[model samples]
Target: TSAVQQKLAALEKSSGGRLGVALIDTADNTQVLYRGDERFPMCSTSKVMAAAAVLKQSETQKQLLNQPVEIKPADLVNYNPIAEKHVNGTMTLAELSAAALQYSDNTAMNKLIAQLGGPGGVTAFARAIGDETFRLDRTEPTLATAIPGDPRDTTTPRAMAQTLRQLTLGHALGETQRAQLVTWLKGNTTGAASIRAGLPTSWTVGDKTGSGDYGTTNDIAVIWPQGRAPLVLVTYFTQPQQNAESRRDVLASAARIIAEGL
Candidate 1:
Protein backbone atom coordinates (compact mmCIF):
# COMPACT_ATOMS: atom_id res chain seq x y z
CA THR A 1 0.00 0.00 0.00
CA SER A 2 2.85 2.38 0.76
CA ALA A 3 4.46 1.71 -2.61
CA VAL A 4 1.13 2.22 -4.36
CA GLN A 5 0.68 5.49 -2.49
CA GLN A 6 4.11 6.72 -3.51
CA LYS A 7 3.54 5.86 -7.15
CA LEU A 8 0.16 7.57 -7.18
CA ALA A 9 1.63 10.67 -5.54
CA ALA A 10 4.36 10.90 -8.12
CA LEU A 11 1.90 10.37 -10.92
CA GLU A 12 -0.38 13.06 -9.59
CA LYS A 13 2.48 15.51 -9.23
CA SER A 14 3.78 14.94 -12.72
CA SER A 15 0.36 15.22 -14.25
CA GLY A 16 -0.36 18.45 -12.36
CA GLY A 17 -3.74 17.09 -11.40
CA ARG A 18 -5.53 15.74 -8.36
CA LEU A 19 -6.44 12.07 -8.38
CA GLY A 20 -8.90 10.13 -6.23
CA VAL A 21 -8.88 6.33 -6.18
CA ALA A 22 -10.77 3.60 -4.38
CA LEU A 23 -10.02 -0.10 -4.83
CA ILE A 24 -11.92 -2.95 -3.22
CA ASP A 25 -11.14 -6.65 -3.52
CA THR A 26 -14.43 -8.48 -3.25
CA ALA A 27 -12.76 -11.73 -2.29
CA ASP A 28 -11.35 -10.78 1.12
CA ASN A 29 -12.86 -7.36 1.60
CA THR A 30 -9.51 -5.60 1.18
CA GLN A 31 -9.69 -1.89 0.41
CA VAL A 32 -7.41 1.02 -0.53
CA LEU A 33 -8.31 4.66 -0.70
CA TYR A 34 -6.57 7.85 -1.92
CA ARG A 35 -8.56 11.07 -1.70
CA GLY A 36 -11.52 8.71 -1.75
CA ASP A 37 -13.75 11.14 0.11
CA GLU A 38 -13.07 14.21 -2.02
CA ARG A 39 -15.83 15.26 -4.37
CA PHE A 40 -15.25 15.15 -8.12
CA PRO A 41 -17.53 15.99 -11.00
CA MET A 42 -19.55 12.96 -12.02
CA CYS A 43 -20.00 13.91 -15.70
CA SER A 44 -21.66 11.07 -17.57
CA THR A 45 -20.56 8.46 -15.05
CA SER A 46 -23.71 9.25 -13.15
CA LYS A 47 -25.47 7.35 -15.87
CA VAL A 48 -24.61 4.14 -14.10
CA MET A 49 -26.39 5.30 -10.98
CA ALA A 50 -29.30 6.45 -13.07
CA ALA A 51 -29.38 3.08 -14.77
CA ALA A 52 -29.28 1.38 -11.40
CA ALA A 53 -32.23 3.45 -10.29
CA VAL A 54 -34.14 2.33 -13.35
CA LEU A 55 -33.28 -1.27 -12.63
CA LYS A 56 -34.27 -0.92 -9.00
CA GLN A 57 -37.58 0.61 -10.02
CA SER A 58 -38.12 -2.26 -12.40
CA GLU A 59 -37.59 -4.81 -9.67
CA THR A 60 -40.91 -3.91 -8.08
CA GLN A 61 -42.54 -2.76 -11.32
CA LYS A 62 -41.52 -5.41 -13.82
CA GLN A 63 -43.02 -3.69 -16.84
CA LEU A 64 -40.81 -0.63 -16.51
CA LEU A 65 -38.05 -1.75 -18.82
CA ASN A 66 -40.39 -2.86 -21.56
CA GLN A 67 -42.25 0.42 -21.77
CA PRO A 68 -41.64 2.46 -24.90
CA VAL A 69 -40.27 5.99 -24.53
CA GLU A 70 -40.32 8.64 -27.18
CA ILE A 71 -37.14 10.48 -28.16
CA LYS A 72 -37.82 14.02 -29.26
CA PRO A 73 -35.32 16.71 -30.29
CA ALA A 74 -36.20 18.67 -27.18
CA ASP A 75 -34.86 15.86 -25.05
CA LEU A 76 -31.49 15.79 -26.77
CA VAL A 77 -28.30 17.48 -25.59
CA ASN A 78 -24.75 17.75 -26.87
CA TYR A 79 -22.86 14.47 -27.36
CA ASN A 80 -26.13 12.72 -27.95
CA PRO A 81 -25.40 10.97 -31.21
CA ILE A 82 -27.29 7.85 -30.25
CA ALA A 83 -30.36 9.83 -29.28
CA GLU A 84 -30.03 12.01 -32.34
CA LYS A 85 -30.34 9.00 -34.59
CA HIS A 86 -33.52 7.98 -32.81
CA VAL A 87 -35.20 11.37 -32.67
CA ASN A 88 -38.95 11.19 -33.25
CA GLY A 89 -38.70 7.43 -32.77
CA THR A 90 -39.70 5.41 -29.77
CA MET A 91 -37.28 3.19 -27.86
CA THR A 92 -37.90 0.85 -24.98
CA LEU A 93 -36.61 1.83 -21.58
CA ALA A 94 -34.17 -1.08 -21.76
CA GLU A 95 -32.87 0.24 -25.06
CA LEU A 96 -32.38 3.72 -23.56
CA SER A 97 -30.50 2.16 -20.68
CA ALA A 98 -28.21 0.45 -23.16
CA ALA A 99 -27.57 3.69 -25.02
CA ALA A 100 -26.89 5.65 -21.85
CA LEU A 101 -24.53 3.12 -20.29
CA GLN A 102 -22.82 1.66 -23.36
CA TYR A 103 -22.65 4.79 -25.47
CA SER A 104 -22.92 7.54 -22.85
CA ASP A 105 -25.81 9.01 -24.71
CA ASN A 106 -26.88 12.28 -23.09
CA THR A 107 -30.44 12.18 -24.29
CA ALA A 108 -30.94 8.63 -23.15
CA MET A 109 -29.66 9.52 -19.69
CA ASN A 110 -31.89 12.57 -19.42
CA LYS A 111 -34.87 10.48 -20.38
CA LEU A 112 -34.04 7.93 -17.70
CA ILE A 113 -33.62 10.68 -15.12
CA ALA A 114 -37.03 12.02 -16.00
CA GLN A 115 -38.48 8.56 -15.68
CA LEU A 116 -36.98 8.26 -12.21
CA GLY A 117 -38.41 11.66 -11.23
CA GLY A 118 -35.38 13.81 -12.04
CA PRO A 119 -31.82 14.17 -10.73
CA GLY A 120 -32.89 13.75 -7.12
CA GLY A 121 -34.18 10.31 -7.94
CA VAL A 122 -30.68 9.05 -8.70
CA THR A 123 -29.47 10.48 -5.40
CA ALA A 124 -32.28 8.66 -3.62
CA PHE A 125 -31.21 5.44 -5.26
CA ALA A 126 -27.65 5.98 -4.05
CA ARG A 127 -28.86 6.57 -0.51
CA ALA A 128 -31.03 3.48 -0.69
CA ILE A 129 -27.93 1.48 -1.63
CA GLY A 130 -26.04 2.90 1.38
CA ASP A 131 -23.95 5.51 -0.42
CA GLU A 132 -24.28 8.74 1.51
CA THR A 133 -21.92 10.83 -0.61
CA PHE A 134 -23.28 10.31 -4.09
CA ARG A 135 -25.40 13.11 -5.47
CA LEU A 136 -26.85 14.13 -8.83
CA ASP A 137 -28.13 17.73 -8.79
CA ARG A 138 -28.52 18.51 -12.47
CA THR A 139 -29.07 17.01 -15.88
CA GLU A 140 -26.49 16.51 -18.62
CA PRO A 141 -24.65 19.27 -20.51
CA THR A 142 -25.36 21.48 -17.52
CA LEU A 143 -23.90 19.00 -15.04
CA ALA A 144 -20.83 18.71 -17.21
CA THR A 145 -19.74 22.15 -16.09
CA ALA A 146 -17.23 20.48 -13.78
CA ILE A 147 -16.36 23.52 -11.75
CA PRO A 148 -13.33 22.90 -9.59
CA GLY A 149 -14.13 22.44 -5.88
CA ASP A 150 -17.85 22.51 -6.48
CA PRO A 151 -19.88 19.88 -4.73
CA ARG A 152 -22.94 19.84 -6.95
CA ASP A 153 -23.43 16.75 -9.06
CA THR A 154 -20.34 15.24 -7.56
CA THR A 155 -19.42 11.92 -5.89
CA THR A 156 -16.43 10.59 -4.00
CA PRO A 157 -14.33 7.77 -5.38
CA ARG A 158 -15.15 5.62 -2.37
CA ALA A 159 -18.86 6.23 -2.75
CA MET A 160 -18.81 5.36 -6.44
CA ALA A 161 -16.74 2.22 -5.86
CA GLN A 162 -19.17 1.14 -3.16
CA THR A 163 -22.12 1.78 -5.46
CA LEU A 164 -20.52 -0.28 -8.22
CA ARG A 165 -19.77 -3.09 -5.80
CA GLN A 166 -23.32 -3.12 -4.58
CA LEU A 167 -24.93 -3.05 -8.00
CA THR A 168 -22.61 -5.60 -9.52
CA LEU A 169 -21.89 -7.91 -6.61
CA GLY A 170 -24.27 -7.19 -3.76
CA HIS A 171 -28.08 -7.65 -3.55
CA ALA A 172 -28.93 -4.22 -4.91
CA LEU A 173 -30.69 -5.67 -7.94
CA GLY A 174 -32.22 -8.92 -9.11
CA GLU A 175 -30.10 -11.47 -10.94
CA THR A 176 -31.44 -10.55 -14.36
CA GLN A 177 -31.17 -6.82 -13.70
CA ARG A 178 -27.66 -7.14 -12.37
CA ALA A 179 -26.67 -9.18 -15.39
CA GLN A 180 -28.11 -6.58 -17.70
CA LEU A 181 -26.24 -3.73 -15.97
CA VAL A 182 -22.97 -5.63 -16.14
CA THR A 183 -23.53 -6.43 -19.81
CA TRP A 184 -24.12 -2.78 -20.57
CA LEU A 185 -21.04 -1.63 -18.65
CA LYS A 186 -18.92 -4.30 -20.34
CA GLY A 187 -20.01 -2.94 -23.66
CA ASN A 188 -19.06 0.67 -22.84
CA THR A 189 -17.34 2.37 -25.78
CA THR A 190 -15.70 5.37 -24.11
CA GLY A 191 -13.18 3.82 -21.73
CA ALA A 192 -10.64 2.36 -24.13
CA ALA A 193 -7.98 4.93 -23.19
CA SER A 194 -8.69 4.78 -19.45
CA ILE A 195 -8.72 1.86 -16.99
CA ARG A 196 -9.04 -0.83 -19.65
CA ALA A 197 -5.77 0.28 -21.23
CA GLY A 198 -3.87 -0.40 -18.04
CA LEU A 199 -5.25 -3.86 -17.29
CA PRO A 200 -3.83 -7.17 -18.48
CA THR A 201 -5.58 -8.89 -21.33
CA SER A 202 -6.28 -11.86 -19.08
CA TRP A 203 -8.45 -9.66 -16.87
CA THR A 204 -12.00 -8.82 -17.90
CA VAL A 205 -13.65 -5.50 -16.99
CA GLY A 206 -16.92 -3.58 -17.19
CA ASP A 207 -16.61 0.15 -16.70
CA LYS A 208 -18.38 3.51 -16.94
CA THR A 209 -16.48 6.73 -17.73
CA GLY A 210 -17.25 10.40 -17.17
CA SER A 211 -15.69 13.43 -18.87
CA GLY A 212 -16.43 17.03 -18.00
CA ASP A 213 -15.00 20.54 -18.09
CA TYR A 214 -11.91 21.55 -16.09
CA GLY A 215 -10.10 18.34 -16.97
CA THR A 216 -12.36 16.11 -14.92
CA THR A 217 -12.24 12.49 -16.06
CA ASN A 218 -13.46 9.46 -14.14
CA ASP A 219 -13.86 5.73 -14.60
CA ILE A 220 -15.42 3.17 -12.27
CA ALA A 221 -15.47 -0.54 -12.89
CA VAL A 222 -15.86 -4.10 -11.68
CA ILE A 223 -12.84 -6.06 -12.80
CA TRP A 224 -12.44 -9.84 -12.85
CA PRO A 225 -8.88 -10.94 -12.47
CA GLN A 226 -8.25 -14.49 -13.55
CA GLY A 227 -7.78 -16.92 -10.63
CA ARG A 228 -8.83 -14.23 -8.16
CA ALA A 229 -11.88 -12.48 -6.84
CA PRO A 230 -13.44 -9.57 -8.64
CA LEU A 231 -12.21 -6.05 -7.84
CA VAL A 232 -14.09 -2.80 -7.89
CA LEU A 233 -11.92 0.17 -8.97
CA VAL A 234 -12.76 3.85 -9.21
CA THR A 235 -10.54 6.66 -10.49
CA TYR A 236 -11.39 10.35 -10.57
CA PHE A 237 -9.01 12.97 -11.96
CA THR A 238 -9.28 16.74 -12.08
CA GLN A 239 -7.11 19.80 -12.58
CA PRO A 240 -7.45 23.06 -10.68
CA GLN A 241 -7.00 25.08 -13.85
CA GLN A 242 -10.03 26.17 -15.78
CA ASN A 243 -10.80 24.34 -19.03
CA ALA A 244 -7.82 22.07 -18.62
CA GLU A 245 -7.64 19.01 -20.78
CA SER A 246 -8.38 15.62 -19.19
CA ARG A 247 -5.57 13.08 -19.26
CA ARG A 248 -6.55 9.52 -20.03
CA ASP A 249 -2.95 8.42 -19.53
CA VAL A 250 -3.18 9.52 -15.89
CA LEU A 251 -6.17 7.28 -15.31
CA ALA A 252 -4.50 4.42 -17.14
CA SER A 253 -1.39 4.81 -15.02
CA ALA A 254 -3.45 4.79 -11.83
CA ALA A 255 -5.06 1.53 -12.90
CA ARG A 256 -1.64 0.06 -13.59
CA ILE A 257 -0.43 1.06 -10.14
CA ILE A 258 -3.41 -0.57 -8.48
CA ALA A 259 -3.04 -3.75 -10.52
CA GLU A 260 0.65 -4.08 -9.77
CA GLY A 261 0.13 -3.37 -6.08
CA LEU A 262 -2.25 -6.30 -5.87
Candidate 2:
Protein backbone atom coordinates (compact mmCIF):
# COMPACT_ATOMS: atom_id res chain seq x y z
CA THR A 1 0.00 0.00 0.00
CA SER A 2 2.78 2.39 0.86
CA ALA A 3 4.48 1.65 -2.41
CA VAL A 4 1.31 2.51 -4.30
CA GLN A 5 1.01 5.66 -2.25
CA GLN A 6 4.50 6.78 -3.13
CA LYS A 7 4.06 6.09 -6.80
CA LEU A 8 0.88 8.16 -6.92
CA ALA A 9 2.54 10.95 -5.01
CA ALA A 10 5.44 11.00 -7.43
CA LEU A 11 3.11 10.99 -10.41
CA GLU A 12 1.15 13.88 -8.96
CA LYS A 13 4.37 15.79 -8.47
CA SER A 14 5.16 15.53 -12.14
CA SER A 15 1.66 16.18 -13.35
CA GLY A 16 1.31 19.91 -14.15
CA GLY A 17 -2.32 20.21 -13.11
CA ARG A 18 -4.32 18.66 -10.29
CA LEU A 19 -5.02 14.97 -9.92
CA GLY A 20 -8.00 13.61 -8.03
CA VAL A 21 -7.99 9.91 -7.15
CA ALA A 22 -9.97 7.65 -4.85
CA LEU A 23 -10.05 3.88 -4.26
CA ILE A 24 -12.56 2.06 -2.12
CA ASP A 25 -12.72 -1.50 -0.83
CA THR A 26 -16.18 -2.97 -1.18
CA ALA A 27 -15.42 -5.63 1.39
CA ASP A 28 -15.07 -3.17 4.28
CA ASN A 29 -16.14 0.06 2.61
CA THR A 30 -12.73 1.53 3.36
CA GLN A 31 -11.40 4.26 1.05
CA VAL A 32 -8.18 6.02 0.08
CA LEU A 33 -8.66 9.65 -0.91
CA TYR A 34 -5.85 11.41 -2.79
CA ARG A 35 -6.89 15.00 -3.51
CA GLY A 36 -10.34 13.48 -3.76
CA ASP A 37 -12.14 16.72 -2.96
CA GLU A 38 -10.74 18.71 -5.88
CA ARG A 39 -13.03 19.36 -8.83
CA PHE A 40 -12.27 18.25 -12.39
CA PRO A 41 -14.01 18.17 -15.73
CA MET A 42 -16.15 15.07 -16.16
CA CYS A 43 -16.22 15.09 -19.98
CA SER A 44 -17.85 11.82 -21.06
CA THR A 45 -17.76 10.25 -17.63
CA SER A 46 -21.02 12.15 -17.15
CA LYS A 47 -22.50 9.70 -19.63
CA VAL A 48 -22.77 7.07 -16.95
CA MET A 49 -25.14 9.26 -14.97
CA ALA A 50 -26.91 10.17 -18.19
CA ALA A 51 -27.39 6.48 -19.00
CA ALA A 52 -28.62 5.85 -15.47
CA ALA A 53 -31.21 8.58 -15.85
CA VAL A 54 -32.27 7.19 -19.21
CA LEU A 55 -32.72 3.68 -17.81
CA LYS A 56 -34.63 5.01 -14.81
CA GLN A 57 -36.90 7.03 -17.08
CA SER A 58 -37.51 3.97 -19.18
CA GLU A 59 -38.55 1.98 -16.14
CA THR A 60 -40.86 4.77 -14.95
CA GLN A 61 -42.47 5.06 -18.38
CA LYS A 62 -42.61 1.29 -18.69
CA GLN A 63 -40.56 1.57 -21.86
CA LEU A 64 -38.70 -1.44 -23.10
CA LEU A 65 -34.98 -1.20 -23.73
CA ASN A 66 -35.40 -2.12 -27.39
CA GLN A 67 -37.85 0.67 -28.18
CA PRO A 68 -36.63 2.66 -31.18
CA VAL A 69 -35.96 6.34 -31.93
CA GLU A 70 -35.05 7.98 -35.20
CA ILE A 71 -31.68 9.67 -35.62
CA LYS A 72 -31.60 13.02 -37.39
CA PRO A 73 -28.76 14.61 -39.38
CA ALA A 74 -28.58 17.82 -37.35
CA ASP A 75 -28.04 15.65 -34.28
CA LEU A 76 -24.80 14.36 -35.72
CA VAL A 77 -21.65 15.58 -33.97
CA ASN A 78 -17.97 14.90 -34.48
CA TYR A 79 -15.28 13.73 -31.97
CA ASN A 80 -17.42 10.64 -31.39
CA PRO A 81 -15.31 8.13 -33.25
CA ILE A 82 -17.62 5.29 -32.26
CA ALA A 83 -20.94 7.09 -32.80
CA GLU A 84 -19.77 8.79 -35.99
CA LYS A 85 -19.79 5.47 -37.79
CA HIS A 86 -23.45 4.84 -36.93
CA VAL A 87 -24.89 8.21 -37.89
CA ASN A 88 -28.34 9.04 -39.33
CA GLY A 89 -30.16 5.87 -38.39
CA THR A 90 -32.77 4.52 -36.06
CA MET A 91 -31.64 2.89 -32.82
CA THR A 92 -33.13 1.91 -29.49
CA LEU A 93 -32.52 3.82 -26.30
CA ALA A 94 -30.59 0.84 -25.01
CA GLU A 95 -28.34 0.90 -28.04
CA LEU A 96 -27.76 4.59 -27.63
CA SER A 97 -26.95 4.05 -23.95
CA ALA A 98 -24.51 1.31 -24.83
CA ALA A 99 -22.85 3.44 -27.47
CA ALA A 100 -22.53 6.27 -25.01
CA LEU A 101 -21.27 4.10 -22.19
CA GLN A 102 -19.25 1.45 -23.95
CA TYR A 103 -17.54 3.68 -26.48
CA SER A 104 -18.06 7.26 -25.20
CA ASP A 105 -20.28 8.19 -28.10
CA ASN A 106 -20.90 11.92 -28.33
CA THR A 107 -23.80 11.73 -30.76
CA ALA A 108 -25.56 9.19 -28.58
CA MET A 109 -25.03 11.42 -25.59
CA ASN A 110 -26.53 14.47 -27.34
CA LYS A 111 -29.55 12.43 -28.28
CA LEU A 112 -29.75 11.26 -24.70
CA ILE A 113 -29.56 14.81 -23.38
CA ALA A 114 -32.30 15.83 -25.76
CA GLN A 115 -34.34 12.79 -24.72
CA LEU A 116 -33.89 13.70 -21.06
CA GLY A 117 -35.18 17.22 -21.78
CA GLY A 118 -31.73 18.77 -22.14
CA PRO A 119 -28.85 19.29 -19.71
CA GLY A 120 -31.13 20.34 -16.86
CA GLY A 121 -32.78 16.96 -16.76
CA VAL A 122 -29.44 15.20 -16.48
CA THR A 123 -28.47 17.51 -13.61
CA ALA A 124 -31.75 16.75 -11.86
CA PHE A 125 -30.97 13.07 -12.24
CA ALA A 126 -27.46 13.61 -10.88
CA ARG A 127 -28.85 15.25 -7.76
CA ALA A 128 -31.37 12.46 -7.43
CA ILE A 129 -28.43 10.07 -7.23
CA GLY A 130 -26.45 12.02 -4.56
CA ASP A 131 -24.12 14.09 -6.77
CA GLU A 132 -23.75 17.60 -5.43
CA THR A 133 -21.33 19.00 -8.02
CA PHE A 134 -21.86 17.93 -11.63
CA ARG A 135 -23.52 19.55 -14.63
CA LEU A 136 -23.97 18.87 -18.37
CA ASP A 137 -23.68 22.33 -19.85
CA ARG A 138 -23.14 21.46 -23.48
CA THR A 139 -23.66 18.54 -25.80
CA GLU A 140 -20.97 16.86 -27.89
CA PRO A 141 -19.27 18.49 -30.91
CA THR A 142 -19.05 21.42 -28.53
CA LEU A 143 -16.37 19.81 -26.38
CA ALA A 144 -13.70 22.26 -27.45
CA THR A 145 -15.64 25.18 -26.02
CA ALA A 146 -16.49 23.66 -22.64
CA ILE A 147 -13.42 25.10 -20.98
CA PRO A 148 -13.50 25.28 -17.17
CA GLY A 149 -16.55 27.45 -17.13
CA ASP A 150 -19.71 27.74 -15.12
CA PRO A 151 -22.37 25.14 -15.95
CA ARG A 152 -19.79 22.98 -17.74
CA ASP A 153 -19.64 19.32 -16.72
CA THR A 154 -17.46 19.01 -13.64
CA THR A 155 -17.08 16.68 -10.62
CA THR A 156 -14.73 15.67 -7.85
CA PRO A 157 -13.12 12.27 -7.83
CA ARG A 158 -14.74 11.63 -4.44
CA ALA A 159 -18.19 12.43 -5.75
CA MET A 160 -17.71 10.32 -8.87
CA ALA A 161 -16.33 7.44 -6.83
CA GLN A 162 -19.38 7.64 -4.60
CA THR A 163 -21.62 7.73 -7.65
CA LEU A 164 -20.09 4.51 -8.95
CA ARG A 165 -20.20 2.98 -5.49
CA GLN A 166 -23.85 3.82 -4.97
CA LEU A 167 -24.82 2.68 -8.43
CA THR A 168 -23.11 -0.68 -8.00
CA LEU A 169 -24.52 -1.10 -4.49
CA GLY A 170 -28.12 -0.55 -5.60
CA HIS A 171 -28.81 3.00 -4.48
CA ALA A 172 -30.99 3.85 -7.50
CA LEU A 173 -31.46 0.43 -9.08
CA GLY A 174 -32.11 -3.10 -7.91
CA GLU A 175 -29.78 -6.07 -8.24
CA THR A 176 -30.66 -6.89 -11.87
CA GLN A 177 -30.48 -3.28 -12.98
CA ARG A 178 -27.17 -2.71 -11.27
CA ALA A 179 -25.84 -5.87 -12.83
CA GLN A 180 -26.82 -4.60 -16.27
CA LEU A 181 -25.10 -1.27 -15.64
CA VAL A 182 -21.84 -2.93 -14.64
CA THR A 183 -22.10 -5.21 -17.64
CA TRP A 184 -22.21 -2.23 -19.98
CA LEU A 185 -19.25 -0.67 -18.21
CA LYS A 186 -17.37 -3.96 -18.50
CA GLY A 187 -18.13 -4.00 -22.20
CA ASN A 188 -16.59 -0.56 -22.63
CA THR A 189 -13.90 -0.90 -25.35
CA THR A 190 -12.34 2.59 -25.35
CA GLY A 191 -10.95 2.14 -21.85
CA ALA A 192 -8.54 -0.45 -23.21
CA ALA A 193 -6.01 2.42 -23.46
CA SER A 194 -6.65 3.79 -19.98
CA ILE A 195 -7.79 2.24 -16.72
CA ARG A 196 -8.17 -1.29 -18.02
CA ALA A 197 -4.78 -0.98 -19.70
CA GLY A 198 -2.77 -1.57 -16.54
CA LEU A 199 -4.65 -4.32 -14.71
CA PRO A 200 -3.16 -7.62 -13.65
CA THR A 201 -4.14 -10.55 -15.85
CA SER A 202 -6.34 -12.13 -13.19
CA TRP A 203 -8.19 -8.93 -12.36
CA THR A 204 -11.40 -7.78 -14.03
CA VAL A 205 -12.14 -4.08 -14.55
CA GLY A 206 -15.14 -2.03 -15.72
CA ASP A 207 -14.82 1.70 -16.25
CA LYS A 208 -15.98 4.96 -17.89
CA THR A 209 -13.42 7.36 -19.41
CA GLY A 210 -13.70 11.16 -19.77
CA SER A 211 -11.47 13.56 -21.71
CA GLY A 212 -11.08 17.27 -22.33
CA ASP A 213 -8.60 19.77 -23.86
CA TYR A 214 -4.87 19.60 -23.22
CA GLY A 215 -4.42 16.12 -21.89
CA THR A 216 -7.17 15.83 -19.32
CA THR A 217 -8.05 12.22 -18.54
CA ASN A 218 -10.66 11.01 -16.12
CA ASP A 219 -11.77 7.45 -15.40
CA ILE A 220 -14.18 6.00 -12.90
CA ALA A 221 -13.85 2.24 -12.59
CA VAL A 222 -15.15 -0.85 -10.82
CA ILE A 223 -12.40 -3.39 -10.25
CA TRP A 224 -12.83 -7.01 -9.20
CA PRO A 225 -9.71 -8.42 -7.59
CA GLN A 226 -8.62 -11.99 -8.23
CA GLY A 227 -10.16 -13.31 -5.02
CA ARG A 228 -11.59 -10.39 -3.06
CA ALA A 229 -14.73 -8.31 -3.51
CA PRO A 230 -14.74 -5.52 -6.06
CA LEU A 231 -13.65 -1.92 -5.51
CA VAL A 232 -14.54 1.45 -7.07
CA LEU A 233 -11.55 3.42 -8.36
CA VAL A 234 -11.73 6.98 -9.66
CA THR A 235 -8.84 8.91 -11.27
CA TYR A 236 -9.06 12.52 -12.54
CA PHE A 237 -5.97 13.99 -14.18
CA THR A 238 -6.10 17.57 -15.36
CA GLN A 239 -3.81 19.26 -17.92
CA PRO A 240 -1.19 16.58 -17.75
CA GLN A 241 1.46 16.24 -20.47
CA GLN A 242 0.09 17.66 -23.71
CA ASN A 243 0.35 14.38 -25.58
CA ALA A 244 -2.65 12.05 -25.53
CA GLU A 245 -0.59 8.92 -24.90
CA SER A 246 1.21 10.62 -22.03
CA ARG A 247 -2.06 11.28 -20.30
CA ARG A 248 -3.15 7.71 -20.89
CA ASP A 249 0.11 6.45 -19.45
CA VAL A 250 -0.60 8.44 -16.29
CA LEU A 251 -3.94 6.70 -15.95
CA ALA A 252 -2.34 3.31 -16.59
CA SER A 253 0.20 4.08 -13.91
CA ALA A 254 -2.53 4.92 -11.45
CA ALA A 255 -4.37 1.70 -12.24
CA ARG A 256 -1.19 -0.30 -12.00
CA ILE A 257 -0.49 1.16 -8.60
CA ILE A 258 -3.84 -0.05 -7.33
CA ALA A 259 -3.59 -3.42 -9.01
CA GLU A 260 -0.16 -4.12 -7.54
CA GLY A 261 -1.28 -3.03 -4.10
CA LEU A 262 -4.17 -5.45 -4.18
TM per candidate comes to 0.98, 0.90
Question: Whole-model lDDT, candidate 1?
Answer: 0.91
TM-score, predicted candidate 1 vs. hidden true structure: 0.98
RMSD of each: 1.0, 2.4
**Candidate of highest TM-score:** 1
**Tens digit of per-residue lDDT, candidate 1, span 110-165:** 99999999999999989988999988999988988989878899999888998899
List runs of model 1 lying over 4 Å from the truth: none
Q: Over the stretch 97-143, how does candidate 2's per-residue lDDT look in tens digits?
A: 89899988888898788888988898888899878877777777564
Candidate 2 — what's its lDDT? 0.78
Ten-residue stretch with the least lDDT total in model 1? 73-82
